[PDB]
Design an enzyme around this catalytic site. Structure first.
Site, short mmCIF file in Angstrom:
data_model
loop_
_atom_site.label_atom_id
_atom_site.label_comp_id
_atom_site.label_asym_id
_atom_site.label_seq_id
_atom_site.Cartn_x
_atom_site.Cartn_y
_atom_site.Cartn_z
N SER A 43 -9.76 -3.72 3.02
CA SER A 43 -9.20 -3.69 1.82
C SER A 43 -9.40 -5.17 1.01
O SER A 43 -8.78 -5.33 -0.26
CB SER A 43 -7.60 -3.67 1.90
OG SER A 43 -7.24 -2.48 1.89
N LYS A 207 -4.93 -11.33 -0.62
CA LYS A 207 -5.37 -9.93 -0.45
C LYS A 207 -5.44 -9.91 1.01
O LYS A 207 -6.51 -10.35 1.64
CB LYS A 207 -6.42 -9.58 -1.30
CG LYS A 207 -6.72 -8.02 -1.14
CD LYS A 207 -5.51 -7.11 -1.71
CE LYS A 207 -5.76 -5.77 -1.14
NZ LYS A 207 -5.14 -5.62 0.31
N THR A 208 -4.97 -8.86 1.77
CA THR A 208 -5.22 -8.67 3.21
C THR A 208 -6.19 -7.66 3.19
O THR A 208 -6.20 -6.94 2.30
CB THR A 208 -3.77 -8.27 3.98
OG1 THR A 208 -3.27 -7.29 3.15
CG2 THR A 208 -2.90 -9.43 3.96
N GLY A 209 -6.64 -7.25 4.51
CA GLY A 209 -7.51 -6.21 4.97
C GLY A 209 -7.06 -5.81 6.27
O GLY A 209 -7.12 -6.73 7.20
#
EC number: 3.5.2.6
Length: 261
Positions: A43, A207-209
């Site tokens: 993501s 923003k994480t993933g």
């Protein structure tokens, strides 16, 4: 123990591969660990898709408020916001917000579709001088994160450089840059990642993933109270396909590299 020794020690006990890239905008100095190695973005790639739409909006004043129909067939595996709007519409701005602040996968696919496909996101990244980033698939397959697979990957340094250009640099016109920053700061999914390794009062946008092979990522812009911003990318992945995510490792890495600031 130097910062480099601390990161190596952290990785040794982690059971995975750690990738870190921190840019101190005060003097452009950097702290790198496997920063030139590729990792599946998962993501975190959403930032590039949202930014690509923001770039388009610079020359189309009606783009961000453009309606987009949400159908039941559009829903994939994780649609916290999109599912609330089936049979209705969401503007491109709302899709950007959902993709970034809730990591909505349907929102990401809508952004990619609008742009014309994954390759269009890659082209946008290239226009920003990012010669590393590559988006090959849509949601949810872009999260397979298979070791050695070049699809949907980038390096910590490349992403740190581009995130810096996007949020604090030359990539976007002012209004668009401010919008991206607002979206990142309002993220709801990164409490346990980079944010957990920093002073509670520091302002952060991230923003994480997350994906298969216990891939756990986070890219952030950090605003200390008395220092210039820091741009930090922390990527982590493991050898077994169904490994659990390790957001704690990202928090630990963040604490290590931001010591002193």
């Amino acid at each position: 123990n130097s910062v480099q020794q601390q990161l190596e020690a952290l990785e040794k006990s982690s059971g995975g591969r750690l990738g870190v890239a921190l840019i101190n905008t005060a003097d452009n100095s950097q702290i790198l660990y496997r920063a030139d190695e590729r990792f599946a973005m998962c993501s975190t790639s959403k930032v590039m898709a949202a930014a690509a739409v923001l770039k388009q909006s610079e020359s189309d004043k009606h783009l961000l408020n453009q309606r987009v129909e949400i159908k039941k067939s559009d829903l994939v595996n994780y649609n916290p916001i999109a599912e609330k709007h089936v049979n209705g519409t969401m503007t491109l701005a709302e899709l950007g917000a959902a993709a970034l602040q809730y990591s909505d996968n349907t929102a990401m696919n809508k952004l990619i579709a609008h742009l014309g496909g994954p390759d269009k996101v890659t082209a946008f990244a290239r226009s920003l001088g990012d010669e590393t980033f590559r988006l090959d698939r849509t949601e949810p397959t872009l999260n397979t994160a298979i070791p050695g697979d070049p699809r949907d990957t980038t390096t910590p340094l490349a992403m740190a450089q581009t995130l810096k250009n996007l949020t604090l640099g030359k990539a976007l016109a002012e209004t668009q840059r401010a919008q991206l920053v607002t979206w990142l700061k309002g993220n709801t999914t990164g409490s346990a990642s980079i944010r957990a390794g920093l002073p509670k009062s520091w302002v952060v946008g991230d923003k994480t993933g997350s994906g298969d092979y216990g891939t756990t990522n986070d890219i952030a812009v950090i605003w200390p109270e008395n220092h210039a911003p820091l741009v930090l990318v922390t990527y982590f992945t493991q050898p077994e396909q169904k490994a659990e995510r390790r957001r704690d490792i990202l928090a630990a890495a963040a604490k290590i590299v931001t010591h002193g600031f």
